[PDB]
Protein backbone atom coordinates (compact mmCIF):
# COMPACT_ATOMS: atom_id res chain seq x y z
CA UNK A 1 0.00 0.00 0.00
CA UNK A 2 1.02 3.74 -0.32
CA UNK A 3 1.07 5.82 2.59
CA UNK A 4 -2.15 8.10 3.66
CA UNK A 5 -1.63 12.23 3.93
CA UNK A 6 -1.96 14.85 6.12
CA UNK A 7 -5.12 17.03 6.72
CA UNK A 8 -3.36 19.41 5.15
CA UNK A 9 -0.16 20.87 3.91
CA UNK A 10 1.26 24.56 4.21
CA UNK A 11 3.49 26.84 6.17
CA UNK A 12 3.29 26.55 9.74
CA UNK A 13 4.36 29.85 11.22
CA UNK A 14 7.08 29.62 14.22
CA UNK A 15 6.32 29.95 18.25
CA UNK A 16 7.36 34.09 17.98
CA UNK A 17 6.01 34.67 14.55
CA UNK A 18 2.62 32.94 15.47
CA UNK A 19 2.30 34.90 18.85
CA UNK A 20 3.94 37.89 16.67
CA UNK A 21 0.75 37.79 14.45
CA UNK A 22 -2.02 36.44 17.03
CA UNK A 23 -1.54 39.38 18.86
CA UNK A 24 -1.49 41.37 15.65
CA UNK A 25 -5.28 40.14 14.54
CA UNK A 26 -6.32 41.23 18.65
CA UNK A 27 -5.57 44.31 18.48
CA UNK A 28 -7.05 44.72 14.89
CA UNK A 29 -10.31 43.24 16.46
CA UNK A 30 -10.56 45.80 19.54
CA UNK A 31 -9.88 48.61 17.02
CA UNK A 32 -12.32 47.52 15.11
CA UNK A 33 -14.73 46.81 17.43
CA UNK A 34 -14.39 49.93 19.03
CA UNK A 35 -14.28 51.97 16.10
CA UNK A 36 -17.40 54.42 15.59
CA UNK A 37 -17.08 53.67 11.21
CA UNK A 38 -17.84 50.09 12.56
CA UNK A 39 -20.20 50.37 15.09
CA UNK A 40 -22.12 52.31 11.92
CA UNK A 41 -22.60 49.24 10.31
CA UNK A 42 -23.42 46.63 13.02
CA UNK A 43 -26.95 45.92 11.01
CA UNK A 44 -25.21 44.59 7.96
CA UNK A 45 -22.86 42.32 10.40
CA UNK A 46 -25.43 40.30 12.40
CA UNK A 47 -29.13 40.39 12.52
CA UNK A 48 -30.31 41.15 15.65
CA UNK A 49 -29.10 43.73 18.78
CA UNK A 50 -25.39 47.73 22.27
CA UNK A 51 -21.36 47.70 21.32
CA UNK A 52 -19.81 44.35 20.03
CA UNK A 53 -16.52 42.98 21.42
CA UNK A 54 -15.21 40.94 18.19
CA UNK A 55 -12.31 39.07 20.16
CA UNK A 56 -15.24 36.97 21.83
CA UNK A 57 -17.60 36.84 18.03
CA UNK A 58 -15.06 35.61 16.69
CA UNK A 59 -14.82 32.49 19.41
CA UNK A 60 -13.53 30.16 17.56
CA UNK A 61 -9.34 30.53 17.15
CA UNK A 62 -6.60 28.58 16.46
CA UNK A 63 -5.77 25.93 19.13
CA UNK A 64 -2.15 26.67 19.05
CA UNK A 65 0.59 27.88 16.20
CA UNK A 66 -0.78 29.95 13.33
CA UNK A 67 -0.53 28.55 9.93
CA UNK A 68 -1.22 28.89 6.01
CA UNK A 69 -2.89 25.90 4.07
CA UNK A 70 -1.61 25.76 0.56
CA UNK A 71 -3.45 22.22 -0.14
CA UNK A 72 -6.04 20.48 2.12
CA UNK A 73 -5.96 16.87 1.09
CA UNK A 74 -7.89 15.32 3.48
CA UNK A 75 -6.01 12.26 4.07
CA UNK A 76 -6.48 11.43 0.34
CA UNK A 77 -9.78 11.69 0.28
CA UNK A 78 -9.92 15.07 -1.37
CA UNK A 79 -9.45 15.73 -5.39
CA UNK A 80 -6.04 16.74 -6.59
CA UNK A 81 -4.75 15.79 -3.53
CA UNK A 82 -3.14 12.57 -4.78
CA UNK A 83 -1.21 15.01 -7.57
CA UNK A 84 -0.11 17.68 -5.08
CA UNK A 85 1.92 15.58 -3.12
CA UNK A 86 3.89 13.64 -5.09
CA UNK A 87 5.44 16.85 -6.72
CA UNK A 88 8.61 17.17 -7.03
CA UNK A 89 8.46 20.80 -5.51
CA UNK A 90 6.04 19.80 -2.48
CA UNK A 91 9.09 17.18 -1.63
CA UNK A 92 11.60 19.35 -2.23
CA UNK A 93 10.19 21.93 0.01
CA UNK A 94 8.85 20.02 2.36
CA UNK A 95 11.04 20.72 5.45
CA UNK A 96 12.42 23.67 4.21
CA UNK A 97 12.03 27.60 6.01
CA UNK A 98 10.21 30.01 4.45
CA UNK A 99 8.61 33.75 4.98
CA UNK A 100 5.62 34.83 3.82
CA UNK A 101 4.10 38.38 3.50
CA UNK A 102 0.91 39.51 5.11
CA UNK A 103 -0.80 42.54 3.15
CA UNK A 104 -4.15 43.54 5.29
CA UNK A 105 -6.38 41.56 7.89
CA UNK A 106 -9.87 41.20 6.90
CA UNK A 107 -13.47 40.60 9.02
CA UNK A 108 -16.74 39.57 8.03
CA UNK A 109 -20.07 38.11 9.75
CA UNK A 110 -17.98 34.95 10.02
CA UNK A 111 -14.07 35.51 9.55
CA UNK A 112 -11.25 36.93 10.72
CA UNK A 113 -8.05 36.58 8.85
CA UNK A 114 -4.69 37.26 7.61
CA UNK A 115 -4.21 37.84 3.80
CA UNK A 116 -1.35 36.34 2.54
CA UNK A 117 0.54 37.05 -0.50
CA UNK A 118 3.22 34.14 -1.73
CA UNK A 119 6.28 34.73 -3.61
CA UNK A 120 6.90 32.60 -7.32
CA UNK A 121 8.23 29.75 -5.50
CA UNK A 122 6.25 29.96 -2.87
CA UNK A 123 3.45 30.00 -5.84
CA UNK A 124 5.04 26.56 -6.91
CA UNK A 125 3.66 25.06 -4.04
CA UNK A 126 0.24 26.62 -4.52
CA UNK A 127 -1.83 23.57 -6.62
CA UNK A 128 -2.75 24.68 -10.17
CA UNK A 129 -5.61 22.78 -9.62
CA UNK A 130 -8.43 21.58 -11.98
CA UNK A 131 -11.55 22.11 -10.26
CA UNK A 132 -12.25 25.62 -9.32
CA UNK A 133 -15.15 26.87 -7.49
CA UNK A 134 -16.62 30.14 -8.25
CA UNK A 135 -14.36 32.07 -6.38
CA UNK A 136 -10.92 31.47 -7.96
CA UNK A 137 -11.49 33.64 -10.87
CA UNK A 138 -9.56 36.60 -11.55
CA UNK A 139 -7.09 36.66 -8.98
CA UNK A 140 -3.84 35.81 -9.20
CA UNK A 141 -2.60 32.60 -8.12
CA UNK A 142 -2.14 32.04 -4.69
CA UNK A 143 -4.60 35.27 -3.55
CA UNK A 144 -6.63 32.59 -1.57
CA UNK A 145 -3.13 32.26 0.09
CA UNK A 146 -4.09 33.37 3.73
CA UNK A 147 -3.78 32.73 7.70
CA UNK A 148 -7.35 32.06 9.63
CA UNK A 149 -7.78 34.38 13.32
CA UNK A 150 -11.08 33.62 14.13
CA UNK A 151 -14.54 32.59 12.77
CA UNK A 152 -17.71 33.36 14.15
CA UNK A 153 -19.71 29.89 16.09
CA UNK A 154 -21.29 27.70 13.37
CA UNK A 155 -18.94 28.46 10.61
CA UNK A 156 -16.95 25.56 8.23
CA UNK A 157 -13.44 25.86 7.81
CA UNK A 158 -13.15 26.39 3.99
CA UNK A 159 -14.95 30.11 4.52
CA UNK A 160 -11.67 31.92 5.72
CA UNK A 161 -10.69 31.83 1.93
CA UNK A 162 -13.81 32.22 0.62
CA UNK A 163 -13.91 35.60 2.53
CA UNK A 164 -10.75 36.42 1.47
CA UNK A 165 -11.93 35.77 -2.06
CA UNK A 166 -14.79 37.41 -2.25
CA UNK A 167 -13.56 40.34 -1.04
CA UNK A 168 -10.39 40.31 -3.43
CA UNK A 169 -13.02 40.17 -6.30
CA UNK A 170 -14.64 43.25 -5.24
CA UNK A 171 -11.25 45.19 -4.93
CA UNK A 172 -10.89 43.73 -8.14
CA UNK A 173 -14.09 45.12 -9.67
CA UNK A 174 -12.80 48.76 -8.24
CA UNK A 175 -15.32 48.94 -5.09
CA UNK A 176 -13.45 49.11 -2.38
CA UNK A 177 -14.25 52.80 -1.63
CA UNK A 178 -12.09 55.34 -0.05
CA UNK A 179 -10.28 54.77 3.21
CA UNK A 180 -12.90 55.67 6.51
CA UNK A 181 -9.81 55.59 8.79
CA UNK A 182 -6.02 55.27 9.37
CA UNK A 183 -5.82 52.25 12.43
CA UNK A 184 -2.52 52.61 13.53
CA UNK A 185 -1.07 49.65 11.47
CA UNK A 186 -2.41 51.23 8.30
CA UNK A 187 -5.62 52.04 5.34
CA UNK A 188 -9.39 50.77 6.09
CA UNK A 189 -12.07 50.08 3.89
CA UNK A 190 -15.48 49.43 3.96
CA UNK A 191 -16.47 47.17 1.57
CA UNK A 192 -20.56 46.42 2.37
CA UNK A 193 -22.27 43.12 3.34
CA UNK A 194 -20.10 43.66 6.86
CA UNK A 195 -16.90 43.22 5.24
CA UNK A 196 -13.93 45.15 5.90
CA UNK A 197 -10.06 45.39 4.65
CA UNK A 198 -6.77 46.92 6.28
CA UNK A 199 -3.93 47.00 4.19
CA UNK A 200 -0.75 47.24 6.56
CA UNK A 201 1.83 50.30 5.41
CA UNK A 202 4.91 47.92 6.17
CA UNK A 203 3.62 44.25 5.26
CA UNK A 204 4.43 41.70 7.95
CA UNK A 205 7.00 38.97 7.49
CA UNK A 206 6.58 35.39 9.48
CA UNK A 207 8.72 32.93 9.44
CA UNK A 208 7.63 29.63 9.10
CA UNK A 209 8.46 25.20 7.66
CA UNK A 210 6.49 23.86 5.18
CA UNK A 211 5.01 20.60 6.30
CA UNK A 212 1.90 18.90 6.50
CA UNK A 213 -0.76 18.37 9.22
CA UNK A 214 -2.17 15.39 10.72
CA UNK A 215 -3.00 15.91 14.06
N1 LIG B 1 -6.68 15.80 18.03
C1 LIG B 1 -7.40 16.75 17.42
O1 LIG B 1 -8.49 16.50 16.93
C2 LIG B 1 -6.86 18.15 17.34
C3 LIG B 1 -5.87 18.58 18.22
C4 LIG B 1 -5.39 19.88 18.11
C5 LIG B 1 -5.91 20.71 17.13
N2 LIG B 1 -6.86 20.28 16.29
C6 LIG B 1 -7.37 21.21 15.27
O2 LIG B 1 -8.46 20.63 14.55
C7 LIG B 1 -8.43 21.10 13.20
C8 LIG B 1 -9.02 20.06 12.26
O3 LIG B 1 -9.36 20.71 11.04
P1 LIG B 1 -10.80 21.40 10.88
O4 LIG B 1 -11.87 20.37 11.14
O5 LIG B 1 -10.78 22.70 11.64
O6 LIG B 1 -10.81 21.76 9.32
P2 LIG B 1 -10.52 20.61 8.24
O7 LIG B 1 -11.64 20.59 7.22
O8 LIG B 1 -10.16 19.34 8.96
O9 LIG B 1 -9.23 21.28 7.56
C9 LIG B 1 -8.13 21.69 8.38
C10 LIG B 1 -7.55 22.98 7.83
O10 LIG B 1 -7.60 22.91 6.41
C11 LIG B 1 -8.14 24.11 5.85
N3 LIG B 1 -9.39 23.74 5.14
C12 LIG B 1 -10.48 23.16 5.70
N4 LIG B 1 -11.44 22.95 4.76
C13 LIG B 1 -10.96 23.39 3.58
C14 LIG B 1 -11.45 23.46 2.18
N5 LIG B 1 -12.69 23.01 1.83
N6 LIG B 1 -10.62 24.00 1.25
C15 LIG B 1 -9.39 24.45 1.56
N7 LIG B 1 -8.90 24.41 2.81
C16 LIG B 1 -9.61 23.90 3.84
C17 LIG B 1 -8.35 25.08 7.00
O11 LIG B 1 -7.24 25.97 7.02
P3 LIG B 1 -7.40 27.56 6.85
O12 LIG B 1 -8.67 27.89 7.59
O13 LIG B 1 -6.13 28.13 7.46
O14 LIG B 1 -7.49 27.75 5.35
C18 LIG B 1 -8.35 24.21 8.24
O15 LIG B 1 -7.75 24.87 9.35
C19 LIG B 1 -6.98 21.43 12.89
O16 LIG B 1 -6.88 22.65 12.13
C20 LIG B 1 -6.30 21.56 14.24
O17 LIG B 1 -5.81 22.89 14.46
C21 LIG B 1 -7.34 19.03 16.37
Known sequence: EKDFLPLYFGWFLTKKSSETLRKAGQVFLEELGNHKA???????????????????????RPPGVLSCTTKFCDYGKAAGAEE???????????????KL????????????????????????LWPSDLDKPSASE??????????????AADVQP???????????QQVKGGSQGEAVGELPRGKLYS????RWMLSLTK???????????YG
Open 38 to 60: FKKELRHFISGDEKLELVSYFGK
Open 158 to 168: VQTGLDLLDIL
Open 84 to 98: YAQQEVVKRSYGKAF
Open 138 to 151: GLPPGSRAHVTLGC
Open 203 to 213: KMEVKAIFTGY
Open 191 to 194: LGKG
Open 101 to 124: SISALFVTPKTAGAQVVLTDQELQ
